[PDB]
Enzyme design. Structure first.
Site, mmCIF file in Angstrom:
data_model
loop_
_atom_site.group_PDB
_atom_site.id
_atom_site.type_symbol
_atom_site.label_atom_id
_atom_site.label_comp_id
_atom_site.label_asym_id
_atom_site.label_seq_id
_atom_site.Cartn_x
_atom_site.Cartn_y
_atom_site.Cartn_z
ATOM 1 N N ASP A 61 0.685 -1.124 -0.266
ATOM 2 C CA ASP A 61 0.074 -0.280 0.420
ATOM 3 C C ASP A 61 0.554 1.518 -0.182
ATOM 4 O O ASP A 61 2.221 1.323 -0.703
ATOM 5 C CB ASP A 61 -0.825 0.193 1.442
ATOM 6 C CG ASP A 61 -0.296 -0.092 2.396
ATOM 7 O OD1 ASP A 61 0.776 -0.160 3.061
ATOM 8 O OD2 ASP A 61 -1.153 0.284 3.420
HETATM 9 P P1 LIG Z 1 -2.057 4.414 1.568
HETATM 10 O O1 LIG Z 1 -2.480 4.539 0.485
HETATM 11 O O2 LIG Z 1 -3.017 3.298 2.395
HETATM 12 O O3 LIG Z 1 -2.528 5.207 2.843
HETATM 13 C C1 LIG Z 1 -3.884 4.987 3.011
HETATM 14 C C2 LIG Z 1 -4.122 6.518 3.848
HETATM 15 C C3 LIG Z 1 -3.557 6.424 4.845
HETATM 16 C C4 LIG Z 1 -4.071 7.439 3.540
HETATM 17 C C5 LIG Z 1 -6.275 5.880 3.776
HETATM 18 O O4 LIG Z 1 -6.308 5.668 3.193
HETATM 19 C C6 LIG Z 1 -6.831 7.031 4.667
HETATM 20 O O5 LIG Z 1 -6.550 8.133 3.915
HETATM 21 N N1 LIG Z 1 -6.800 7.046 5.918
HETATM 22 C C7 LIG Z 1 -8.115 7.897 6.979
HETATM 23 C C8 LIG Z 1 -7.336 8.991 6.741
HETATM 24 C C9 LIG Z 1 -5.852 9.086 7.901
HETATM 25 O O6 LIG Z 1 -5.184 8.088 8.291
HETATM 26 N N2 LIG Z 1 -5.695 9.786 9.484
HETATM 27 C C10 LIG Z 1 -5.378 9.642 10.333
HETATM 28 C C11 LIG Z 1 -3.979 10.018 9.244
HETATM 29 S S1 LIG Z 1 -2.547 10.896 10.971
HETATM 30 C C12 LIG Z 1 -3.078 9.663 12.527
HETATM 31 O O7 LIG Z 1 -3.490 9.768 12.651
HETATM 32 C C13 LIG Z 1 -1.309 9.237 12.117
HETATM 33 C C14 LIG Z 1 -0.694 10.719 13.490
HETATM 34 C C15 LIG Z 1 0.405 9.906 14.440
HETATM 35 C C16 LIG Z 1 1.438 10.335 14.099
HETATM 36 C C17 LIG Z 1 1.866 11.714 14.045
HETATM 37 C C18 LIG Z 1 3.326 11.852 13.991
HETATM 38 C C19 LIG Z 1 4.214 13.323 14.751
HETATM 39 C C20 LIG Z 1 4.850 12.507 15.522
HETATM 40 C C21 LIG Z 1 6.506 13.644 15.066
HETATM 41 C C22 LIG Z 1 7.801 12.984 15.442
HETATM 42 C C23 LIG Z 1 9.007 14.152 14.703
HETATM 43 C C24 LIG Z 1 9.977 13.396 15.834
HETATM 44 C C25 LIG Z 1 9.677 12.579 16.834
#
Ligand SMILES: *P(=O)(O)OCC(C)(C)[C@H](O)C(=O)NCCC(=O)NCCSC(=O)CCCCCCCCCCCCC
Ligand SMILES: CCCCCCCCCCCCCCCCCC(=O)OC[C@H](COP(=O)([O-])OCC(O)COP(=O)([O-])OC[C@@H](COC(=O)CCCCCCCCCCCCCCCCC)OC(=O)CCCCCCCCCCCCCCCCC)OC(=O)CCCCCCCCCCCCCCCCC
Ligand SMILES: CCCCCCCCCCCCCCCCCC(=O)OC[C@H](COP(=O)([O-])OCC(O)COP(=O)([O-])OC[C@@H](COC(=O)CCCCCCCCCCCCCCCCC)OC(=O)CCCCCCCCCCCCCCCCC)OC(=O)CCCCCCCCCCCCCCCCC
Ligand SMILES: CCCCCCCC/C=C\CCCCCCCC(=O)OC[C@H](COP(=O)(O)OCCN)OC(=O)CCCCCCC/C=C\CCCCCCCC
Ligand SMILES: CCCCCCCC/C=C\CCCCCCCC(=O)O[C@H](COC(=O)CCCCCCC/C=C/CCCCCCCC)COP(=O)(O)OCCN
Ligand SMILES: CCCCCCCC/C=C\CCCCCCCC(=O)O[C@H](COC(=O)CCCCCCC/C=C/CCCCCCCC)COP(=O)(O)OCCN
Ligand SMILES: CCCCCCCCCCCCCCCCCC(=O)OC[C@H](COP(=O)(O)OCCN)OC(=O)CCCCCCCCCCCCCCCCC
Ligand SMILES: CCCCCCCCCCCCCCCCCC(=O)OC[C@H](COP(=O)(O)OCCN)OC(=O)CCCCCCCCCCCCCCCCC
Lengths: 63, 178, 174, 125, 459, 165, 128, 87, 104, 67
Positions: free
Chosen positions: H42
């Protein structure tokens, strides 16, 4: 041979030119080259006048 | 760089860019490879946890909170590849990049020092001159009446043509020119 | 060396101590001085002997220009342009000579500082007072005349100084 | 660094000595017959040796001897260990004399404090 | 002086009688010969001036200015023949005639021994300059620039004519020697204040003083290359020469009247350097740099001490050479890309290396880099200002910092970075342009070798 | 003088590391260089020891005397405290360089182009490496005594530089 | 939660933290499309002229022409004396001059007073 | 200084990395395989693959370009074009 | 221009401008060689507070250490001839006030 | 000498560089030990530090308080 030609040119010619310039042109005018006078210590022999600088007095020696 | 950008970034594109940036900064924090592997797997676990989400409003809010968390926890001095825009070797060889138009101002003696190179260069110049009219005609045939809606360019549709507007792309200076 | 006048540019007699080595180790400075004398000093001395031989065959002389004294701006009448011109030129030449006298005293001071070295604060007290006196007199003469200085302006300055001194003497004698 | 700083700052600055004003008691106060320090090297000898003005202290004769030793045995830069030690020992003795002066100042100051307290108590009573 | 004046008036018929393709060759060669002849004027005296006749005399202040003028003429010929290729023979000869007339007027201006003849010649220099600007300038704004230049100068200089004739009626003479020997103090009165104002304001406008300087960017930007070269290198120095000469009769009133002009000069020095920092045009940047340096020279003349006059003379000669060279470099760039914008042509170091070297050397002299005569003059002025007051050092240091900033900004912007991709007509530098830069820069370093030749009479 | 010696050598070793790792300047991407690059490793260790004031290297004859003179003078208390803390921090960042560049597992890209076998590099570092060991002793013993030494001082104050290092 | 980021003029707001980036309207999408169309039109024009084999010289930039004109030659025609303009001009053009006049006048008056009273150290001050 | 890259060397290195990926079966992996159409990965897997290639070759692929490389051959062509490799 | 995207195919890659697009009024000061307004990891107010507090604390502590100096428990160093009166340039004609140092 | 590049493996080393690095590390440690054996006063001091508490009032010239 390469460093022999290098050494005569680069070191010998400049030192000749500079020594000639200093001995006969620079030091032909007053105060152009001023030397700090040599240090004189007790019990010394002044070469200019054949002089003898006397020794210091007896130290109050410990151990 | 090589690809024309679009009008906007999709939600998936934003999520993937955040994923890559977060992994790079996590690697900058976690210097050692084993520690980086561990915490990278945890980060992917978080992304996979929110992977399936039908409510796009909730998905956008999750992305916004993740961006705020990243900005708070980002490395002040992240690792940058030497040739990348922030890198130490960025734009070092730009003063060595000279164009071929600068090449054709050479004196005849200079050009005589490279007889075989300049014959091929003359062939390239002839090839460029023989295709310009077809290139401009293809460009003006395929454009919409309003004008170009994007920066993308078409290929050559015929067996004797060349992709329109190709000269400077093809003859750009080498990455290590001198 | 007879190149300059030892009275104008004095130097103390040079007391160089005799070497008193206490080691069997050879002196690299002495060896290198011998090498320098062999390789450099002898060729340059031969070259200078040749050049000085060539010079002595073409001996010729140059003289020092002598200027006689002329009446000064005090004696010149008002708006008498010729006497004023001669007096102004004479004052300019005297200004140049005074500048060079100050330069000579400064050269004495600098040379003495370097020569004495670590005890210059005490050993150069004679040169410091001489420089102080010469510089003070030079300053009182030519201190604030301006870019367009002249013998008339210096005469006005001296008349002002004389008036001030006369007033101070009268007040003291009062 | 030291405990004297703590005593003076977090304590009785009146009883502790003041380095920028010491000594404040007469040099013969409590010393019946006190001998002056002896200077071996003369002014002309130090001037000839071109000693630095901060090196023209009461240990200057050992410094002159060390300089003369180092000049004579030039190529052997490890031949004046005894002269170096003599100079260092003279400097050490000078420093401990400075320390003795400081301690004398301190206990004279606290003796004066005790005497004035005794007088104050006698006057009060 | 006739041995230098007559060969110029003979350059005129030679120019009009030479063949159509030999005008540049003849003019250049004989200008160089006249410059060589004028080099003999540097053998000056320590007591007085060289009083050739009743009409002309030379001094340690006049001689370097004459040498600079005579040396600048052939360089202007080279730049002109660069930009005037397609002109007709008659118009080429008219351009060379204007240059020769300007040189003749400048020679007689620096050697004129009367304030009234000096006024006549120093006002006569306006006509050839105005014709050159408003006729052979490129853009529309040459007409307005000529109007500004002409009317600023004349508004400054007409009260000077009134004051000069008044002084002649009062004292009987305008001869410089007589007014020097028969000078009297100027009492503090309103009449004396306005006499002082008439003289000094004429030369301050010519300098220019900050606030009376707009004509300078207008004219220097819009003039052709020879016009720019003579406007900055020599014509700005008529103000300094005149102010140095005429302040003989203005004391002690100069002690009290110099405060507004010193304040204007110091603050406007700061302001024009800061303007240079943010200029989108190269020629305007060089013009404002000229304004800053002339502000420093004005400060030197107004504080009026033997150390300040030497610094003023040195800075005037050095600025003449440096600004002329900078204008020539900018003009070569313009003849490539036909635009004066500074950010249009970049990467000129990787397209033209030797011109990059010339840019580096000119910008290193523009900022005071020791031991260049630019630095020598600036440092003498700074020392005299320090004796005048001890906050002039604050203003002077700020000015030096900003000068280095904008000089290196100009160098980095034009020469460094990456070349503009679509500018594909940067042909290799011509031998003529390279020789022009060399002839600008070598005399400056030789003058560094022998600095007493440009320190003025007070040396 | 002493700092000229060992700091120049440290910069040359850093440049050797940079060149061997394809213009990489990040200690996060250096690693394993203790065994990968022997001569530059030993040169950098000797230089970092000389920088921090190892008891008989070229930095001992200047930094130790400077710290002794600062402790034994009528000085600013805050200046003395900051000087001592800075000596500790010097040891700290020298440790950081060594630890992150030479110890541990590699972090550089898999194409190993490490090669420090050029005679020019080796000879230049060798010449600046002899000076970082012995030049302090030679210079210190050959110059005349231009200051009065601090012969007498408390033992803890004598050992202050070593303890903080 | 996490401490918030306060944008300044010299440390602007990141695009990822801009609240408007996560509130997208259908009109926002068409505004973005129109902007991209403008950029594409300009890029096509520039690239055609740029790749022309017969073009020699500088591709004139009307935007650059307008910028340089607006920076210099269009300022006075569009200048009006307002209270703000008058006050800023008077301040920035008169205040510094009189401030420096006062500073230098006071310093030189003190110097001359000391000279007259004869208690200013002027020894060795030969060069002036 | 460093040996020049070749198309075969770039191909070998990219396939080496991909065979060291656990989610890709090394037996059915070819230079024309699609990461999602016939390997079943993916978008996050593709992001990690591109980052692994960035670490392998020591340079960065911008997100605008990296989102399109869906094939080892596409990665090879991109890297050769960026490094000026023609052989 | 520092805030402008670096990975885009700009017409002027160093200036990060395209041909024909409007130019900011202050491009002359917003070039990559000049004033940068890009976002920073820490907020500008926090940066100002931390920097000013650090420098003011250091200034205050330097003043405190000046009024509370650190020294050693020793008396003044003693110099032989009236504290080297003639060596420091004292007047040979005038007689200095004697300085006498005793043993201890 | 030509050093062939390695891929995912420890680089090829040289006997000359190994022996040179070892010799110079050994030289540094020998120098440190040799200098400490001879000139141990430079590290541990040379003269004892007096204790002012042990100095008698009689030798410091302090009279009895009552007197
Ligand atoms: P591929 O096309 O399969 O991708 C799948 C995706 C992700 C595009 C999905 O189809 C999708 O759109 N899903 C629903 C939307 C979604 O995923 N929302 C959540 C995304 S953000 C999430 O919740 C993760 C955040 C957690 C991590 C945060 C990062 C911050 C930490 C930074 C630290 C830097 C120094 C350590
Ligand atoms: C002696 C040399 C000159 C010195 C000058 C010094 C001052 C003298 C003033 C009076 C001069 C005399 C009159 C000359 C008139 C000329 C008119 C003319 O047609 O000129 C072109 C003419 C040739 O062209 P042409 O074939 O007639 O074709 C004309 C067509 O128009 C061609 O077609 P075109 O379209 O190509 O031409 C157009 C052109 C045609 O336009 C012209 O030709 C007009 C020229 C100017 C008009 C005359 C002005 C007179 C007023 C005094 C000021 C003059 C200064 C400039 C003098 C220019 C002289 C040509 O007009 C323009 O381009 C417009 C330009 C507008 C701006 C410039 C014009 C004004 C300049 C003057 C103002 C500035 C004055 C400053 C103040 C100081 C003054 C000293 O030139 C000559 O014939 C040259 C004349 C001199 C010959 C040499 C004489 C000496 C011989 C040797 C003597 C040796 C002596 C002994 C030595 C010892 C050894 C033996
Ligand atoms: C010397 C002339 C310097 C200016 C023109 C440079 C021309 C040039 O392009 O050269 C490069 C070019 C080298 O070829 P290239 O590398 O292919 O050139 C391509 C690029 O241009 C290559 O470009 P590049 O980047 O390689 O350019 C190199 C060089 C090109 O630029 C320069 O050389 C400019 C240097 C001056 C900078 C601006 C002035 C700064 C203030 C100082 C002013 C006074 C200086 C001293 C007095 C000088 C008197 C002449 O620039 C620099 O290296 C930057 C220097 C930065 C300033 C250095 C620090 C300040 C000076 C500190 C010391 C001051 C002296 C007093 C010390 C007190 C104690 C003793 O040079 C030549 O080919 C030289 C041949 C032509 C000239 C000589 C002709 C033969 C005759 C020689 C003897 C003449 C006397 C008669 C003897 C009879 C027997
Ligand atoms: C509107 C207000 C204008 C103010 C600025 C002045 C400019 C307009 C000129 C109008 C004349 C101004 C009055 C000039 C003063 C005057 O006439 O007398 C001065 C004085 C008195 O002469 P006596 O009659 O003999 O007195 C003897 C007493 N027993 O005569 C002189 O000394 C000669 C002075 C010449 C007058 C010069 C005019 C002063 C103007 C200053 C020049 C500044 C203009 C420079 C322009 C710069 C802009 C480009
Ligand atoms: C150490 C100093 C000694 C130097 C002495 C120099 C004396 C002159 C030597 C140089 C002159 C150059 C030319 C010499 C002979 C000409 C050679 C030749 O035949 O070529 C001519 C060269 O012609 C020229 O280029 C003209 C230049 C030669 C004449 C200019 C020199 C006259 C200078 C006189 C000097 C006297 C000045 C002394 C008084 C000082 C005045 C201030 C043909 O070329 P073109 O005419 O251009 O071809 C086109 C025809 N279809
Ligand atoms: C420490 C630096 C101080 C610099 C010098 C000191 C001078 C005082 C500081 C500036 C005060 C005014 C100077 C000129 C500034 C003009 C004011 C301005 O630009 O705005 C005018 C407003 O001015 C007016 O029209 C009315 C004139 C007077 C109002 C402004 C001056 C009031 C100054 C207050 C006096 C001092 C208050 C004392 C408080 C205690 C101080 C010790 C127009 O308003 P806007 O349309 O909103 O344009 C601004 C766009 N953002
Ligand atoms: C809307 C109107 C805008 C007007 C703008 C004006 C700008 C400011 C110019 C002057 C700036 C500095 C002012 C300094 C000053 O006031 O000096 C006073 C000076 C000394 O007099 P005083 O101190 O009384 O001395 C007595 C002895 N103790 O007094 C004197 O020296 C006497 C008078 C000298 C000045 C006469 C006029 C000349 C003014 C300067 C040049 C003007 C032209 C250039 C300025 C810009 C023009 C655009
Ligand atoms: C840790 C925090 C420490 C905070 C210390 C605050 C300042 C203490 C203080 O003021 O002590 C009094 C005095 C110094 O005060 P002073 O500098 O004379 O003037 C004070 C007005 N600003 O200090 C003294 O009198 C100190 C007495 C010893 C002086 C040693 C020599 C100087």
């Amino acid at each position: 041979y390469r460093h022999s030609i290098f050494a005569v040119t680069h070191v010998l010619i400049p030192v000749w030119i500079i020594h000639y310039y200093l001995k006969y042109h620079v030091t032909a005018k007053p105060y152009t080259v001023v030397e700090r006078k040599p240090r004189i210590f007790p019990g010394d022999t002044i070469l200019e006048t054949g002089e003898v600088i006397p020794l210091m007095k007896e130290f109050p020696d410990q151990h | 760089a090589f690809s024309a950008p679009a009008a906007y970034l999709t939600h998936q594109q934003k999520v993937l860019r955040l994923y890559k940036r977060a992994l790079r900064h996590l690697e900058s924090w976690c210097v050692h490879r084993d520690k980086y592997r561990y915490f990278a797997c945890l980060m992917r676990a978080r992304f996979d946890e929110h992977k399936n989400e039908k409510d796009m409003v909730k998905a956008t809010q999750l992305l916004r909170q993740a961006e705020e968390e990243f900005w708070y926890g980002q490395h002040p001095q992240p690792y940058i590849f030497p040739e990348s825009p922030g890198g130490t070797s960025y734009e070092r060889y730009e003063c060595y990049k000279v164009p071929e138009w600068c090449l054709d101002d050479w004196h005849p003696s200079e050009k005589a020092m490279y007889p075989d190179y300049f014959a091929k260069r003359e062939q390239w110049k002839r090839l460029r001159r023989e295709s310009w009219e077809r290139e401009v005609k293809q460009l003006q045939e395929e454009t919409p009446p309003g004008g170009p809606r994007t920066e993308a360019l078409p290929p050559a549709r015929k067996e004797g043509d060349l992709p329109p507007l190709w000269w400077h792309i093809v003859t750009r200076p080498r990455e290590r020119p001198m | 060396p007879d190149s300059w006048d030892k009275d104008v540019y004095p130097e103390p007699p040079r007391r160089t101590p005799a070497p008193a080595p206490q080691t069997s180790l050879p002196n690299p400075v002495t060896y290198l001085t011998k090498i320098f004398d062999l390789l450099v000093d002898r060729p340059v001395t031969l070259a200078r002997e040749f050049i000085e031989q060539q010079h002595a065959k073409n001996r010729y002389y140059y003289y020092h220009r002598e200027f006689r004294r002329v009446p000064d701006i005090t004696e010149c009448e008002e708006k008498d342009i010729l006497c004023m011109f001669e007096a102004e030129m004479q004052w300019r030449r005297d200004y140049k000579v005074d500048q060079e006298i100050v330069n000579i005293i400064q050269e004495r001071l600098k040379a003495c500082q370097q020569r004495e070295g670590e005890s210059y604060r005490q050993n150069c007290a004679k040169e410091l007072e001489q420089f102080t006196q010469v510089s003070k007199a030079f300053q009182d003469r030519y201190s604030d005349l301006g870019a367009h200085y002249s013998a008339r302006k210096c005469l006005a300055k001296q008349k002002q100084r004389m008036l001030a001194e006369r007033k101070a003497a009268k007040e003291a004698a009062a | 660094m030291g405990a004297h700083l703590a005593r003076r700052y977090l304590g009785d600055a009146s009883k502790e000595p003041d380095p920028l004003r010491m000594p404040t008691f007469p040099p013969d106060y409590g010393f019946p017959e006190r001998k002056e320090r002896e200077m071996v090297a003369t002014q002309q000898e130090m001037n000839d040796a071109q000693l630095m003005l901060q090196q023209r202290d009461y240990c200057a004769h050992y410094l002159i001897q060390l300089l003369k030793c180092k000049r004579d045995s030039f190529p052997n830069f490890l031949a004046c260990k005894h002269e170096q030690h003599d100079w260092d020992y003279c400097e050490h003795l000078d420093y401990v004399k400075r320390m003795k002066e400081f301690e004398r100042e301190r206990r004279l100051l606290q003796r004066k404090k005790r005497r004035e307290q005794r007088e104050a108590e006698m006057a009060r009573g | 002086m006739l041995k230098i004046i007559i060969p110029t008036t003979m350059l005129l018929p030679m120019t009009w009688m030479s063949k159509h393709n030999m005008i540049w060759i003849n003019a250049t060669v004989h200008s160089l010969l006249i410059s060589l002849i004028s080099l003999s004027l540097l053998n000056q005296l320590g007591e007085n001036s060289l009083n050739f006749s009743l009409t002309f005399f030379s001094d340690s202040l006049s001689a370097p200015l004459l040498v600079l003028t005579t040396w600048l003429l052939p360089l202007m010929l080279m730049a002109s023949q660069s930009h005037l290729s397609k002109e007709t023979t008659t118009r080429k000869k008219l351009y060379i005639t204007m240059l020769i007339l300007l040189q003749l007027f400048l020679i007689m201006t620096f050697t004129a021994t009367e304030l009234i003849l000096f006024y006549i010649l120093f006002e006569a220099t306006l006509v050839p300059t105005l014709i050159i600007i408003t006729r052979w300038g490129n853009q529309t704004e040459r007409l307005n620039a000529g109007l500004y230049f002409l009317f600023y100068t004349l508004a400054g200089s007409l009260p000077l004519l009134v004051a000069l004739v008044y002084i002649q009626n009062t004292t009987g003479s305008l001869n410089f020697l007589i007014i020097h020997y028969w000078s009297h103090p100027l009492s503090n009165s309103w009449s004396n204040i306005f006499m002082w104002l008439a003289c000094i304001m004429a030369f301050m406008v010519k300098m220019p003083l900050y606030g009376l300087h707009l004509w300078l960017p207008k004219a220097h930007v819009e003039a052709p290359i020879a016009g720019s070269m003579v406007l900055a290198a020599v014509l700005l120095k008529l103000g300094g020469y005149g102010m140095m000469r005429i302040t003989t009769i203005l004391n002690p009133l100069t002690n009290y009247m110099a405060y507004p002009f010193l304040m204007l000069s110091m603050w406007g020095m700061i302001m024009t350097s800061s303007i240079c920092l943010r200029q989108t045009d190269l020629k305007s940047l060089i013009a404002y740099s000229s304004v800053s340096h002339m502000a420093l020279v004005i400060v030197a003349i107004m504080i009026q001490t033997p150390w300040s006059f030497m610094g003023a003379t040195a800075l005037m000669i050095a600025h003449g050479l440096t600004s002329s060279m900078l204008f020539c470099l900018a003009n070569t760039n313009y003849e490539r890309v036909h635009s004066r914008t500074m950010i249009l042509a970049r990467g000129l170091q990787t397209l033209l290396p030797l011109m990059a070297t010339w840019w580096l050397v000119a910008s290193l002299t523009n900022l005071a880099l020791p031991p260049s005569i630019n630095l020598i003059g600036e440092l003498f002025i700074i020392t005299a200002s320090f004796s005048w007051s001890n906050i002039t050092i604050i203003l002077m240091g700020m000015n030096m910092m900003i000068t280095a900033l904008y000089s290196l900004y100009m160098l980095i912007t034009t020469q460094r970075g990456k070349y503009t991709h679509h500018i594909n007509n940067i042909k290799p530098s011509f031998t003529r342009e390279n020789a022009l830069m060399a002839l600008h820069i070598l005399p400056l370093l030789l003058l560094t070798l022998n600095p007493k030749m440009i320190l003025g009479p007070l040396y | 003088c002493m700092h000229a010696f060992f700091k120049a050598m440290l910069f040359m070793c850093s440049g050797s590391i940079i060149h061997s790792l394809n213009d990489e300047q990040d200690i996060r991407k250096m690693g394993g260089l203790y065994k990968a690059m022997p001569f530059t490793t030993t040169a950098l260790i000797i230089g970092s020891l000389a920088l921090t004031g190892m008891p008989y290297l070229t930095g001992f004859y200047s930094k130790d005397l400077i710290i002794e003179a600062v402790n034994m003078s009528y000085t600013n208390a805050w200046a003395l405290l900051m000087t001592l803390i800075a000596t500790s921090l010097t040891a700290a960042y020298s440790t950081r360089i060594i630890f992150f560049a030479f110890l541990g597992k590699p972090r550089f890209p898999p194409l190993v182009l490490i090669n420090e076998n050029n005679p020019l590099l080796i000879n230049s570092i060798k010449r600046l490496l002899i000076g970082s060991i012995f030049a302090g002793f030679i210079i210190s013993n050959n110059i005349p005594p231009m200051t009065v030494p601090n012969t007498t001082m408390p033992l803890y104050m004598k050992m202050t530089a070593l303890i903080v290092t | 939660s996490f401490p918030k980021y306060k944008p300044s003029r010299l440390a602007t707001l990141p695009a990822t933290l801009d609240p408007a980036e996560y509130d997208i309207s259908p009109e926002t999408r068409k505004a973005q499309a129109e902007r991209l169309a403008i950029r594409s039109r300009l890029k096509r024009e520039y690239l055609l002229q740029y790749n022309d084999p017969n073009r020699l010289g500088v591709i004139e930039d009307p935007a650059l022409i307008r910028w340089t004109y607006a920076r210099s030659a269009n300022i006075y025609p569009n200048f009006r004396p307002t209270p703000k303009t008058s006050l800023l001009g008077a301040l920035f053009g008169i205040g510094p001059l009189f401030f420096w006049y006062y500073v230098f006048k006071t310093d030189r008056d003190k110097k001359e007073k000391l000279i007259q009273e004869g208690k200013l150290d002027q020894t060795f001050n030969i060069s002036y | 200084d460093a040996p020049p890259l070749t198309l075969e060397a770039i191909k070998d290195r990219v396939l080496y990395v991909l065979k060291l990926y656990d989610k890709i079966d090394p037996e059915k992996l070819s230079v024309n395989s699609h990461f999602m159409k016939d390997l079943g990965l993916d978008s996050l897997d593709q992001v990690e693959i591109i980052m692994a290639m960035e670490d392998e070759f020591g340079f960065e692929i911008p997100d605008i370009d990296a989102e399109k490389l869906m094939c080892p051959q596409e990665i090879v062509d991109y890297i050769a074009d960026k490094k000026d490799v023609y052989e | 221009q520092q805030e402008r995207d670096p990975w885009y195919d700009w017409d002027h890659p160093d200036l990060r401008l395209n041909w024909g697009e409007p130019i900011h009024w202050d491009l002359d000061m917003y070039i990559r060689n000049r004033v940068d307004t890009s976002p920073t990891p820490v907020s500008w107010n926090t940066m100002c507070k931390h920097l000013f507090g650090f420098v003011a604390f250091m200034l205050f502590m330097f003043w405190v250490g000046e009024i509370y100096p650190s020294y050693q428990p020793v008396g003044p160093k003693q110099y032989p001839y009236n504290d080297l009166y003639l060596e420091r340039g004292g007047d040979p004609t005038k007689e200095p006030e004697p300085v006498v140092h005793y043993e201890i | 000498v030509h050093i062939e590049p390695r891929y995912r493996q420890f680089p090829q080393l040289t006997r000359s560089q190994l022996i040179q690095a070892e010799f110079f590390s050994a030289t540094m440690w020998f120098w440190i030990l040799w200098r400490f054996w001879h000139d141990s006063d430079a590290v541990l001091g040379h003269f004892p530090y007096p204790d002012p508490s042990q100095w008698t009032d009689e030798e410091l010239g302090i009279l009895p308080d009552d007197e």
